[PDB]
Structure 1
């Protein structure tokens, strides 16, 4: 009996597909077998960090769906995800609602 490589690491992302994309992405001639396991691990953790904050935003808004306004909120409110995605804009995302304090009346 044989078990898949995605759950050999105990993950969800497919190790075989990221292995194939590292091969055919033309990044090197050879690629180590730990490379796709590591890359799928960090990817799955990364999307876990996105989706957890997104679910907390959507549940904070008393909604039950993740619309990209929630993704933009979850990314722009964070500190160390804002640095990863600072240049990237989000389709139909809107902005983080913040108004300068001098524009507001007293």
Structure 2
């Protein structure tokens, strides 16, 4: 499996299959979905690393959308990515 071979947590084959159903080009590459799954894996393991750091900087057990809204608009690490986003909280 290319996901374990690339040592990732996201499925490369699903990112490639989502690039196929989007018809973003005529033909993909061999290692393009491994790179894209490793970047999206990095962004998820950077946002949820901070949501899990902020939940224990508090007594909460799960991760609520209030934690995502409080982290992503603070935390100048990824606050530039969410200048124009709104977590719905409903």
Measured against the shorter chain, the TM-score band is over 0.9
Name the counterpart of 1:62.
59
State the number of aligned residues. Answer: 90
Name the counterpart of 1:39.
36
Q: TM-score, normalised by structure 1?
A: 0.80
Given that residues 57 and 73 in structure 1 are in contact (C-alpha distance below 8 angstroms), is that contact kept between their aligned partners in structure 2? no
Higher helix residue share: 2
Over aligned residue pairs, what C-alpha RMSD do you find? Answer: 1.2
Residues 2-41 of structure 1 mapped to structure 2, 5 A cutoff: 4-41=1-38
Matches of 1:80 and 1:29, distance apart in 2: 35
Task: Please list every run of at least 4 consecutive aligned residues from structure 1 whose deviation after the TM superposition is greater than 6 angstroms.
Answer: none
Question: If you compute each CA radius of gyration, which structure gives the higher value, 1 or 2?
Answer: 1
Shift of 1:80: 3.7
| Structure 1 residue ranges without an equivalent (≥5) | 94-106
Name the counterpart of 1:77.
74
Q: Higher mean Cα deviation, 69-78 or 84-93?
A: 84-93
CA offsets per residue over residues 37-78 of structure 1, 9 Å max, x none? 000000011000011100111111211110011111111111
RCO (CA 8 Å, sep 6+): is it higher in 1 or 2? 2
